[PDB]
A paper describes a structure:
To clarify substrate binding, we directly co-crystallized the wild-type enzyme of TkAcnX (inactive form) with MVA5P, and the crystal structure was elucidated at a resolution of 1.9 Å. The [3Fe-4S] cluster was located at the same position as the structure of the apo-form, and additional electron density around the [3Fe-4S] was clearly modeled as MVA5P. In the structure of the holo-form, TkAcnXS and TkAcnXL showed no large conformational changes from those in the apo-form (chains D and C); r.m.s.d. values on Cα atoms were 0.5 and 0.6 Å, respectively. On the other hand, the two subunits were closely rotated by an angle of ~26°; substrate binding resulted in a more “closed” conformation than the structure in the apo-form. The carboxyl group of bound MVA5P made hydrogen bond(s) and/or salt bridge(s) with the side chains of Thr63(S), Ser130(L), and Lys361(L), the main chain nitrogen atoms of Thr63(S) and Ser130(L), and a water molecule. The water molecule further interacted with the side chain of Tyr365(L). The hydroxyl group of MVA5P on C3 formed hydrogen bonds with the side chains of Glu129(L) and Lys361(L), among which the former interacted with the side chains of Asn79(L) and Ser131(L). The 5-phosphate group made hydrogen bonds with the main chain nitrogen atoms of Gly48(L), Val49(L), and Ser50(L), and the side chains of Asn53(L) and Asn79(L). In addition, Ser62(S) was close to C2 of MVA5P (a distance of 3.2 Å) and superimposed onto Ser70 in AtAcnX. Therefore, the catalytic mechanism of TkAcnX may be similar to that of AtAcnX, except for the involvement of the [4Fe-4S] cluster as a Lewis acid instead of the [2Fe-2S] cluster.
Aconitase superfamily members catalyze the homologous isomerization of specific substrates by sequential dehydration and hydration and contain a [4Fe-4S] cluster. However, monomeric and heterodimeric types of function unknown aconitase X (AcnX) have recently been characterized as a cis-3-hydroxy-L-proline dehydratase (AcnXType-I) and mevalonate 5-phosphate dehydratase (AcnXType-II), respectively. We herein elucidated the crystal structures of AcnXType-I from Agrobacterium tumefaciens (AtAcnX) and AcnXType-II from Thermococcus kodakarensis (TkAcnX) without a ligand and in complex with substrates. AtAcnX and TkAcnX contained the [2Fe-2S] and [3Fe-4S] clusters, respectively, conforming to UV and EPR spectroscopy analyses.
Author numbering:
A (entry chain B), D (entry chain B): 0 to 130
B (entry chain A), C (entry chain A): 1 to 386
The structure:
């Protein structure tokens, strides 16, 4: 299918179902590390699980401790299989790095919609939509 | 990213696992963002301290360093601890002892620049804690990225950080102009101004016009709020911040903030007093002028509060308050200064249902946690409280 | 100088003797120097505290204010007290109580910017204490004249200062370039650089080239020394101080500082260890990094000093040192942190004959008082002391 | 005789004998408030009394507490009758103001020498050398 080319944040390869938010996300406050369930009372995907999915959001916001929430999610095996963002700041990148979660940024995330199947080639920064 | 021969040996493990683990984080980051080299840092500030925030997985991550004999190689200060029951505090002491063992100054405050660790204009540093990042970049003109907790720790251990982002002249230029038409005069006015601007902008470096704060703590709160509802690490204020005169080198768009923007935030944080069972001031940690203001307001009220008032503040400010007699005054009226700690990062759900505060950062986080919230200037809170 | 209607009434005595006495000092100054008006100040710092410096005449001057119910109308901090015998300390307590009665924060430190009173870039303030004037103007880019003790007090009471001198953009421009060819790397290097430059220049605003201090405390000492041997209230350092990029607007002369200039100062402060009976660090008052450095040097020496080491420091720094465990370490080796006090302004002639120090300001004053003086970096003093 | 025109610092009129220093002076450390004797070990007029004289020096240096030494000198009746400086900074001006010591600056002090008799018209900033 169509390919979206971006930037490698953390390498690896993954394929799965996409869950998309259009609002900036802070993992500290926005995601429960015990469950993988979004807990932001104003998230457009509040109540849904990110565990084992391909998480799409535009950019991070909020706490510099977000990196530790990502790490705790991974240790509880409730982290997404990969993360696709429009722009990944240091906090989010750092969480992916210490958690070994494949991650890309620089992708036109408006072209991704919830429920799509996608391949993320994080080593090359490429996202492929599967038809 | 270029590495010196010594840095290559560190990466290779020649100097032990602790330095190699830290270096691997810094090399990954520098490679992502196109940093040319590692640069030395004059200090670090490390967040990820409250056991509520980092959990057992955070303890494991730190113990991995500590068991390899990790030690910071530059002056490093530390963010605040949480407060909780016996089981929580045992875990919380474990975390602080792990940081202590790495040679970090266990200062336990988000305002290290009040006597413990004051960056100089132009200094390259590696700080997490988003409000302190904002303070150091914007108010002092030092240079730091919005570090994650772990990347600030990695930098503290290696003594260097990758040269990208806010370390570079070109990334300190304004990206947008903010014309503040709204009346903004009080602390709580700056709380809601920052709340609004943080969520209205993206990854931006805003230049504020028509903003003349009477008190530095107003800008401390502005940066704290924008770093909570948004991702702002550096901003400029015309006439008031040290880098403002060369901040605009391009033609930029202008957004304007009107009274209606600020009214909307104020009106959403007005839960009834019958739902409030504590007042919290000092997010980020209170300055000594902030403590003085509260002592004066409590003496004018002239009767004790019937709900507790808590002032979170640095050890330095607490000690000055003790020495100058403000602590005794405040305790006369059911107020307390709590050093070394932060209530936003504490598991207080079952102890308090509602928090009145003047902090936009606290109001944002407590709301998102399910608490009732009343946001107002501290003079109004102290006058109106039960 | 233009006065508002309210200021005219104050001058006339309509609001009591205390405000009128202060206003008369400020009006005289503004009229001398051509100030257009009085401007509000965000804070004051008041020197003239040690009984040795001000005497019974100083007590009378302050009591004149206090007996009229004088109170400062802006946030005001206070310089350090002296140390002496019982009769001296009774007088010294009298002075501090007079300042306390005027609503001043009795902080008793020449480094209020370590947690008590931190000026922001661009802030107009009225500070005496020449090293703090230099720090606020040069390192933070705030704006204050080199106030006399009494003119800072007068400004604190009125809450305003005359708009002349360093409050004006044109008087913050460099008047001369200082090319530092000499090797200047350590604290004591900066002590003697400032000693030399202060007495070589006149009423100048120097712009330093080829000067890259590793530590802010190096510039703290540079400004302290130049304000002692000279009258320097503001200086610029290329790349290192917030106003440097528009400091040069004229064609200026360049003086150069060579190794021979610094050797001359060093060699004149080298009295024999057999004439030294105390080590003094912390002029201006020590930062927490300075305290940390000494704890580390004392543990490496590994045996106590046989002459006392004194570290003068702010209450804030003392409390951080207590809390972080440095005080206990230092006391193990015959060192002490002395808060709230200054030895240069103390009548210690009959208690100590010779002082070893790393401070150029202390070395200058103790020499002029007839003491023996050894000036050196604190690592060398701690390693070599008996 | 010849007139040197400068700037009023503190008003008043005085006539007396001049004592000249060519080095900057800090009253805190440079003058004993009990005696009026210069105590700067490097002053060119060390050991001499300023009490009751017309003191000439180029500019102040040193302590912001110098204003209080000037005041103590005046209260001990050991202060000069007037002070002539090349440039008077805030510290020195403040000492003269609270001590009511006539003072001018902006004078070409190189034209004054020890032992001269002079009239200082501080109200107008004028110094007259008496022949
Ligand atoms: C939300 C935040 O204030 C949490 C701090 O937690 P901790 O005290 O560093 O454990 C950090 C930040 O805003 O960057
Ligand atoms: C010499 C000096 O440090 C003396 C301070 O004395 P006091 O502690 O303000 O009484 C003041 C200055 O340098 O301006
Ligand atoms: S760390 Fe400090 S900035 Fe606020 S959320 Fe806690 S008081
Ligand atoms: S007041 Fe402070 S600057 Fe030195 S002379 Fe005393 S320690």
């Amino acid at each position: 299918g169509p390919k979206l080319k971006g930037r490698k944040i953390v390498g690896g390869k993954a394929e799965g179902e996409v869950i998309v938010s259009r609002k900036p996300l802070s993992f500290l406050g926005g995601v429960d590390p015990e469950t993988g369930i979004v807990t932001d009372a104003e998230s457009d995907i509040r109540g849904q699980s990110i565990a084992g999915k391909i998480l799409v959001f535009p950019r991070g916001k909020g706490s510099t401790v977000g990196s530790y929430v990502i790490y705790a999610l991974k240790k509880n095996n409730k982290a997404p299989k990969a993360i696709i963002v429009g722009e990944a700041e240091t906090i989010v990148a750092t969480g992916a790095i210490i958690s070994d979660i494949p991650m890309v940024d620089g992708v036109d995330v408006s072209k991704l919609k919830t429920g799509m199947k996608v391949r993320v080639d994080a080593d090359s920064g490429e996202v492929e939509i599967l038809e | 990213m270029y590495l010196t021969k010594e840095e290559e040996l560190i990466l290779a493990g020649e100097y032990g696992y602790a330095l190699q683990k830290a270096m691997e984080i810094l090399v990954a980051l520098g490679d992502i963002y196109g940093a040319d080299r590692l640069i030395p840092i004059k200090s670090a500030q490390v967040a990820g301290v409250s056991y509520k925030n980092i959990g057992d997985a955070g303890i494991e991550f730190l113990r991995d360093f500590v068991e390899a004999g990790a030690k910071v190689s530059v002056y490093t200060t530390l963010n605040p601890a949480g407060i909780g029951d016996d089981e929580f505090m045992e875990k919380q002491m474990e975390v602080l002892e792990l940081y202590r063992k790495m040679g970090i100054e266990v200062t336990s405050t988000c305002t290290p620049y009040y006597g413990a660790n004051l960056p100089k204009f132009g200094d390259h540093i590696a700080w997490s804690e988003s409000s302190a990042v904002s303070f150091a970049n914007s108010i002092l003109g030092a240079r730091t990225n919005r570090e994650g907790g772990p990347s600030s720790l990695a930098a503290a251990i290696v003594g260097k950080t990758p040269n990208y982002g806010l370390h570079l002249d070109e990334n300190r230029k304004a990206t947008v102009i903010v014309d503040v038409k709204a009346k903004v005069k009080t602390f709580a006015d700056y709380s809601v101004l920052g709340y609004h601007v943080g969520k209205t902008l993206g990854n931006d470096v805003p230049y504020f016009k028509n903003l003349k704060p009477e008190k530095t703590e107003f800008l401390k709160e502005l940066g704290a709020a924008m770093g909570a509802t948004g991702s702002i690490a550096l901003y400029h204020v015309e006439g008031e911040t040290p880098e403002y005169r060369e901040a605009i080198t391009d033609k930029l768009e202008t957004i304007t903030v009107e009274d209606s923007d600020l009214k909307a935030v104020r009106e959403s944080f007005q839960d009834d007093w019958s739902d409030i069972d504590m007042i919290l001031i000092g997010c980020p940690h209170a300055s000594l002028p902030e403590v003085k203001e509260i002592a004066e307001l409590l003496r004018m009220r002239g009767k004790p509060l019937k709900i507790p008032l808590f002032i979170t503040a640095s050890r330095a400010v607490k000690a000055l308050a003790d020495a100058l007699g403000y602590t005794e005054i405040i305790e006369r009226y059911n107020g307390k200064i709590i050093p070394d700690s932060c209530f936003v990062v504490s598991p207080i759900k079952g102890w308090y249902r509602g928090i009145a505060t003047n902090s936009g950062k606290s109001a944002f986080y407590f709301r998102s946690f399910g608490f009732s919230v009343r946001l107002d200037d501290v003079e109004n809170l102290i006058k109106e409280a039960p």
